[PDB]
Ligand SMILES: CC1=C[C@H](O)CC(C)(C)[C@H]1/C=C/C(C)=C/C=C/C(C)=C/C=C/C=C(C)/C=C/C=C(C)/C=C/C1=C(C)C[C@H](O)CC1(C)C
């Protein structure tokens with residue numbers, strides 16, 4: 156299990172997980188707040 | 198009397214407990230450098246004292262206005278009120294006086310016990326004192342500055358800064374007074390929370 | 396204006412300033428400023444046409460005012476005089492304010 | 493010291509007149525540079541000292557102000573006025589020519605002297621009342637000159653800034669505007685329009 | 686009306702562009718029955734377009750002569766939300782990422798084989814240092830003041 160967790164900590168697997176989570180977050184943000192050209196909250 | 202913000206977590210090495218109000222709460226390691234900690238103690242003290250004065254000024258007049266003793270505008274509507282001088286002259290006067298007093302405070306921060314003396318009437322001088330707690334004229338009632346008083350002051354300051362953050366965020370989301378928000382919460386709490394204002 | 400009067404006045408004032416007022420400073424600056432190449436002057440480096448004319452710059456004036464200074468300060472005076480004349484003739488130029 | 497609780501720079505020791513240890517940029521590290529700065533500062537302060545009454549008095553006597561007195565040269569064929577009377581030879585080429593002729597040769601002899609003390613304080617014909625004979629009063633008058641001259645330089649900065657803020661008017665008009673109702677018309681209105 | 690630009694909520698060409706978009710979407714919509722999934726998708730797209738145009742009009746954007754919104758980055762307070770506020774947010778996030786990466790590189794600098802901690806990321810230390818970039822401006826300013834940000838080699 157330690158070796159498998161070490162494999163999960165290697166550069167491509169960790170990069171894939173991180174970038175997939177980031178892409179999912181950005182896609183969900185773009186669904187819930189679509190067509191954002193300005194920052195109108197202030 | 199030290200305590201822990203998190204019972205499981207261990208205190209950092211630079212937070213041994215000499216400073217008042219030490220609960221080991223530096224998870225982001227901002228005050229690892231001793232000079233940084235020395236600056237941040239003064240920053241916390243000044244911010245907390247100003248937050249005390251500010252939260253009192255935006256809470257107690259509003260409470261008295263709601264009761265009916267006085268008719269004072271809200272803290273967000275007090276800028277547009279009428280005074281004997283315009284806001285620009287008041288800002289300039291405040292800038293001049295604050296420049297002087299805060300430059301004096303900054304000299305004491307940089308080197309303690311260096312600006313304790315009056316520059317006009319040289320016979321007047323503050324007694325020797327720790328940085329951040331200038332005795333003498335600033336303590337007319339001669340209250341003892343024990344570490345219990347310092348801890349109580351820091352706790353009230355942290356509560357006041359949290360209250361001011363709540364003040365500004367609540368006015369940003371609802372556009373009404375914080376005591377009005379408290380009254381709305383007390384009307385029926387389970388449908389007047391953070392949730393139903395979004 | 397009268398071109399002769401203005402030209403004579405400006406040339407006389409410029410020559411007066413060069414002879415009396417700004418003479419010692421100029422002489423000290425030419426004493427400190429001499430063109431040299433590779434640590435030696437242009438003439439002694441091998442250039443036969445870079446020799447300074449010591450005969451043309453020798454003068455009988457008590458302070459050393461020579462013909463080249465006369466030409467330079469007269470050029471200043473003539474330029475100033477013609478600037479004055481051409482500006483005074485024109486009844487315009489940054490006047491509306 | 494200019495700034496209490498702040499260490500003095502190594503270039504300044506307080507021996508000079510008006511030496512309050514103020515050099516944040518360290519301009520006067522080189523001693524001959526510091527001597528040149530002393531001479532230039534003294535000349536600047538003396539010129540501003542001659543300036544300040546020369547600006548206030550013509551405004552107080554109702555002759556305009558220190559910006560009206562330069563309007564005539566802007567106009568084509570302008571005529572200068574002194575005490576309300578037009579000077580017959582007061583035209584821009586003649587005034588500029590006599591200013592260049594006489595302002596030079598009086599700034600030239602000032603550069604002929606090599607003594608630094610004589611470059612700052614020449615004495616002789618310029619001290620006819622004998623105020624520099626006693627040394628202690630000489631240093632006291634040096635300090636008084638330095639302080640009043642720095643005040644004059646600050647006053648001239650105020651002159652320029654108030655002229656930029658309020659174009660085409662006089663400093664005494666600004667003083668009267670402040671004295672009319674000080675809580676409403678001041679630097680605050682221009683600092684926050 | 687900065688730089689001769691009409692506001693997008695008072696621009697005829699903006700409404701014209703919305704009309705062309707809605708007309709094209711309706712022409713695509715006419716090929717299917719209204720109760721079908723493609724028709725519902727097209728209707729959702731039309732509603733999204735209408736909401737987008739209304740939001741662009743109400744946001745205060747200045748529309749050019751071609752009917753498209755033009756951003757102003759000169760710093761005008763009416764248009765601080767186009768560049769300056771998103772720019773500040775981006776600078777905060779980028780400083781967060783850079784500070785976290787620099788802290789991780791500093792932490793694994795004095796090891797036996799530091800490169801092994803770069804090909805294989807040590808996740809607990811990285812997750813410990815992830816939130817240290819929340820206060821990145823304060824930490825960076827103090828490190829610059831104490832002379833720890835730069836290396837004198
Ligand atoms: C410590 C730590 C640690 C770790 O390591 C990391 C971390 C976590 C990051 C950190 C932090 C934390 C926190 C929480 C903080 C906070 C702060 C605040 C909030 C402040 C305030 C602060 C605040 C303040 C001062 C305030 C002030 C106020 C005032 C003046 C007022 C004024 C006023 C009045 C009266 C009235 C009128 O009508 C209006 C006005 C004019 C407006």
Ligand SMILES: CC1=C[C@H](O)CC(C)(C)[C@H]1/C=C/C(C)=C/C=C/C(C)=C/C=C/C=C(C)/C=C/C=C(C)/C=C/C1=C(C)C[C@H](O)CC1(C)C
Nearest residue numbers: 541542544618619620621640643644647650651663666667
């Ligand atoms: C050396 C010698 C030598 C020999 O041996 C002998 C003898 C001759 C004696 C000697 C000499 C002497 C002399 C000449 C002196 C002079 C002086 C002066 C003039 C000063 C000034 C001085 C000056 C000064 C201080 C100044 C000051 C100023 C001021 C405050 C100002 C104010 C103001 C006002 C109100 C108003 C406006 O709105 C602003 C202003 C403008 C800001």
Ligand SMILES: CC1=C(/C=C/C(C)=C/C=C/C(C)=C/C=C/C=C(C)/C=C/C=C(C)/C=C/C2=C(C)CCCC2(C)C)C(C)(C)CCC1
Nearest residue numbers: 406407410465466467468469470471472473474475477478
């Ligand atoms: C002998 C002598 C003397 C005398 C002297 C004299 C008298 C001199 C003169 C001198 C002169 C008398 C000089 C002059 C010079 C000049 C020149 C050298 C030239 C100039 C010019 C130029 C260079 C150019 C011009 C032009 C033209 C071409 C046209 C257009 C415009 C112009 C202006 C550009 C005496 C008695 C004192 C003493 C003894 C000795």
